[PDB]
Symmetry: D2
């Protein structure tokens, strides 16, 4: 008899069957920040990692495993084969190609489409009932791509979208007011990053409309230049990329926040990218961030924000530019 | 009036003072993993980061700040000047040089000594009552270096030591037994890494001694080769380094574990590197890991583990080796 | 030698000092729910309990101590003597008399004033720098009582106020909308309980004003009867009291929420009872709930909510009523 | 269109299907302490409460619901009908009769059996795949009763047993040593309370056997009287009952600890009561606490503690007395 059998009497030859499993595909800085954030929030009973770089993948898995004593996620697995991902409730895509020096980031779209053409069918093959959370950029385009390839209904395909943009907005708003971002409310909608739309009518503390207090809010003649808050939502992201080479910690925390609502069926409202055709005169299949109710079935509902004519037109124009690029992608 | 003053009536304008502050020096992978782990465990109400690479430092700080919505640590600061670190309760040193190709371990440690000669006096100036937690390698030697440079009493100078090695031991033990590492008990003592000592007499589940169940435990005669568990404690560290280039997540969690005991005054027992002169025939100023009680004053007590003659001789040999290196360091 | 000295070598024998200490005075259902909530949220490194019923006090203390394995608050103490409370950062007052059958509300408050005349001077003696959080009812009147007895500056005397009423409001709002209360925003201000004021202009999801969507919101004309949401804020409290005899769990969580902002210096915004003289035509020393910024110094700022004429008149009428009662209290 | 439909566009008519549901039956002080502890540890996505006292049940449910803002458990339900319990992963039984003044607690056994004859078939009817965790006293007898009535395999019927007794043991051990109970290891096995067995051979800090350090450990001639540690495991429970009337907080934390391992599939080792026939010469169907591995299938394995002849005989005698009473219960 082995020492294990000397010490331990077994009652059950059990079905190792995962109940609250999450997969992260792509273990770059973003994927691993999502992983550590999910692990430290105790959201999964099993975590699977997938990548194409085999040594890096195994090393990251082992590094996490060596911390198991300090975690409450008892099973961490990895592999290039998607059988390690079977029966995931939630599959997070952070995979992408490396932009080469000098080239334009427009070259990355089709490269990442080709990556998704390999990833997404394998995800579906092993977790046909999962929710897909897309993080890879350009995220609104790639969420549409993931939706198309997966065949999933739109409630189960979620783009991380403007959840991070809105977190940055509330951070910068809190800095100006001396109030924790949790008590500073404001919504950035539409496309992630450059073209996002700040909804000035919704910016408030304790239910007090800042736009009503300060009618110049969000205009160019605002002597306090609150529009700079949204400008810095975009430019601070480019600044972090310039300063440290990439961003990782805030998106990792953002993604774990989305995973928390999904895994725990919270029905909190998050600005994530969803298939928005049938709103705002948008007549094309495109994904844009609006406030969505997130839970165990993905996006079950969304909030219809009342928009100014200018805000609505910006969303329509974003839909047009998304549709224009999408019709030139090769599936 | 400003929008802020329209919205908010100020009662107090008093110089806010830091209450439960941690500093991390060095924002490579290890420092940032310590940072994110401390942040996600809510161990500090203020986090300061220091490095000599100014752009990387600012970018990491901003990245964390952008996740403020998702955290409960309201102040995150950074700078190359140590005034940002003033009044830390705990200062975590992860700074070090990059060992160059063909650079000897002896030349490398001296370069880290020269780094500590700049860091530690500056830390002491602005937080003279802090606890020092030394992570940089060689960690046991550099804990001695920090102790000698700081002038601190020995209770307030702690090497992360074998807390990580023991976590790896318990992970590997749990893998063999099918039990969570939290319930698998076993202690790795002495030097971090290469020369660490597994204390087979303490390995147990539910208080059942594995050595008494299986007297070959820890010997080469053991048909089940349980010595491989300790061999993998050392080799798996080198394997992660080979596979992903460095280690970060497990040491980050290990450091947060130590920080939790110190910041919350828990008086849990951890194997950390402490001044061991007076034990095991060691008469030199050497730091090695033994089980220590950790709380608000650093190391207040240590456990006197009953060691075999062979185990004691390995600690004494380690102390001899460490002192031989330390007495040739240029301070 | 003793077993303890065989096992443990002591380095430091120094008077341990309290670092992040909370006291709860009064260990009825409300005090103990505050206690367990603070313990399970890891808000304090020392918890002191005080009451005049000595056996009940010791039994509650011991019961918590027996769960120490499952907590991270290493010191739990109690006594009728206030030396056990020395150096608390936050002192939570839940003490009060049992209203007798046929005893008037005016006779009852005077009995709680006489209780506060013994409690508050003793608290101040041993923690002169603490923040006072008053929970006992009538909470707004007794916050004034504690302020006048303590001599504390107004920033350090806080009534739990309408944080609980607003939580009930958001729960009931979330039930109607199918959204988690965390994402349902609405503020109940003024007096706790009976005479509280719902601020319909601030009720929103994702920054979308419900009053602007549904102009009948808050009126008797409203076919959807949203005023019933605020009516249930008051009536559901009385219903719980009728059904289980008292309320405890929600106020315990509400108090822990306030304690979290104070202990961690979060500067989140909470509707708590604060000195309101100078607003809304109120010239008397009266405490009512408005949104306040809570941190390490108590209430540092308050938000000036834009109120309708009717809302402002209700706050002014409340202040008139409270002052009429307070000026007849015997100190 | 209602305000809800004006604000929110619905994507999914969804199956409200519970994924991580827990039920507590009996909402006395113990049941509600288990409930609040489970809620504050975020273990369930749905909590159901059952009792026969209808007003108390509704009041406790409402009090919890009013705290929803401060929790992450989005659905709290209650009822006397067990359809509210459908599809629970884990069902915790804390129901029991009130001992009348003067009568012997032996009269309670059959009264609580009769209670279980109503409860357990209804639990099975609506959650035929759940794990049953029995807390009601006498817990080892009633765990056997629940096992018999339910028809479940023994891995899915768990008595809270000596998990609490062992937590008290480690608390008292920590008090003597000045070490947090988390670092003080020691096991109390067998029957809950009066007849429990302290396993002195397993008592250790950092793997250091206290019995080997101090061979009088656990004997009557021990000049330091460490046997008093186990005496106080029993007597401190009776003391709390005398002082406050009952115990609740420590058992609530104990039960949440067991629920954590079960719901998160941790495979930690806990001393819980399990059907032990086939060990220690025990030839009868009886439940006694031994160290069990707990996870998503309940008790999957148990540790075979090496026992002295006296320890083994105490467990055999306990089995005999359990069997003697059980054969006089009426099912
Ligand atoms: N939506 C948002 O708010 C944010 C999104 N991101 C995006 O996250 C993505 C990843 O960011 P980083 O980690 O910094 O990039 P990275 O390039 O370092 O990591 C990408 C990983 O994907 C792996 N990969 C490539 N092809 C793969 C394939 N078929 N299958 C599996 N794995 C594959 C790669 O080997 C790599 O390890 C980027 O697209 C980035 O723009 C980053 C921050 C904010
Ligand atoms: N004790 C343990 O268990 C473990 C310790 N380590 C050690 O952690 C240390 C850091 O590891 P990595 O982050 O991977 O290396 P890294 O080289 O990427 O980071 C070191 C950082 O220290 C900075 N630095 C150099 N001189 C400085 C000075 N005067 N002041 C402030 N910052 C300075 C550097 O700019 C660098 O950003 C290494 O020595 C490593 O061996 C790594 C894992 C396990
Ligand atoms: N502000 C809010 O939102 C809410 C406040 N409360 C109030 O909390 C207070 C306590 O509620 P319960 O625990 O249910 O009542 P309780 O009567 O059971 O507990 C009050 C405790 O105060 C003790 N006491 C009396 N005089 C004392 C003195 N000098 N010093 C120390 N302790 C003393 C009493 O022995 C008692 O144990 C009540 O006034 C209640 O109305 C209750 C829930 C909501
Ligand atoms: N195993 C352990 O370590 C510990 C176990 N306990 C035991 O917990 C049990 C409950 O303790 P308390 O809450 O203080 O007692 P309690 O008598 O106040 O609560 C029992 C509840 O069960 C309800 N009840 C009675 N019959 C019922 C039925 N058919 N169906 C549903 N509910 C029913 C009762 O109405 C009552 O609300 C007791 O047996 C106690 O000995 C208490 C502490 C330690
Ligand atoms: N609506 S969309 O058309 O899908 C969409 C449009 C635009 C972006 C910008 C972008 C990209 C990115 C990378 C590679 C290719 C393209 C690309 C290619 C073709 C056409 C359009 C865009 C975009 N990366 N990126 C990052 N953001 C972070 C962060 O930390 O926020 C870190 S990199 C950001 C947000 C910027 C930092 C604030 C993204 C998406
Ligand atoms: N007792 S000592 O003399 O202080 C002491 C002795 C030996 C070590 C080894 C070591 C080093 C290291 C790097 C550079 C120089 C020296 C050095 C310089 C002079 C003299 C001796 C050694 C040591 N780095 N390193 C790491 N470990 C990890 C991990 O993840 O564990 C990641 S890098 C480890 C632990 C090994 C991987 C498991 C460490 C300390
Ligand atoms: N603005 S004020 O003048 O301070 C102020 C005015 C009125 C109240 C009502 C009240 C009392 C209470 C008890 C005893 C005496 C007095 C009293 C004495 C003198 C003068 C006026 C009132 C008030 N108790 N009480 C509770 N609420 C809960 C809960 O769970 O909410 C549980 S008991 C509530 C809130 C009600 C249930 C919703 C409270 C405060
Ligand atoms: N092995 S057994 O035969 O099942 C078994 C045997 C003995 C007990 C004792 C007991 C009871 C209890 C209540 C009612 C009836 C019987 C009873 C009836 C017939 C025959 C035997 C016992 C026992 N209640 N009780 C509590 N403990 C706590 C705590 O906080 O620990 C709070 S009440 C305790 C533990 C004591 C405080 C430390 C329990 C079980």
């Amino acid at each position: 008899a082995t020492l294990k059998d000397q010490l331990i009497y077994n009652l059950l030859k059990e079905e190792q069957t995962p109940q609250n499993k999450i997969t992260v595909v792509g273990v770059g800085a973003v994927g691993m920040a999502c992983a550590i954030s999910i692990l430290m929030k105790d959201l999964a009973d099993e975590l699977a990692l997938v990548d194409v770089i085999e040594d890096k993948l195994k090393g990251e898995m082992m590094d996490l495993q060596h911390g198991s004593l300090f975690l409450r996620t008892p099973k961490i697995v990895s592999g290039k084969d998607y059988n390690v991902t079977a029966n995931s409730k939630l599959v997070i895509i952070t995979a992408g190609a490396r932009q080469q020096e000098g080239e334009s980031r427009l070259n990355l779209v089709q490269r990442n489409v080709n990556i998704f053409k390999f990833i997404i069918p394998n995800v579906v093959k092993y977790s046909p009932n999962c929710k897909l959370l897309i993080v890879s950029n350009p995220v609104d385009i790639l969420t549409y791509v993931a939706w198309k390839i997966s065949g999933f209904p739109k409630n189960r395909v979620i783009g991380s979208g403007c959840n991070l943009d809105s977190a940055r907005f509330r951070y910068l708003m809190g800095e100006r007011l001396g109030v924790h971002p949790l008590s500073c409310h404001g919504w950035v909608l539409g496309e992630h990053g450059d073209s996002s739309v700040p909804v000035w009518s919704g910016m408030n503390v304790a239910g007090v409309s800042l736009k009503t207090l300060h009618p110049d809010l969000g205009t160019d003649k605002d002597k306090e230049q609150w529009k700079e808050v949204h400008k810095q939502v975009v430019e601070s992201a480019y600044e972090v990329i310039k300063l440290k080479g990439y961003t990782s910690w805030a998106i990792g925390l953002s993604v774990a926040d989305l995973a928390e609502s999904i895994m725990k069926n919270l029905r909190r409202v998050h600005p994530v990218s969803t298939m928005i055709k049938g709103l705002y005169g948008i007549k094309d299949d495109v994904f844009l961030s609006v406030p969505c109710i997130l839970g165990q079935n993905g996006i079950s509902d969304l909030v219809k924000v009342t928009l100014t004519s200018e805000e609505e037109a910006r969303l329509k124009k974003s839909a047009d530019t998304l549709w224009g690029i999408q019709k030139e992608l090769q599936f």
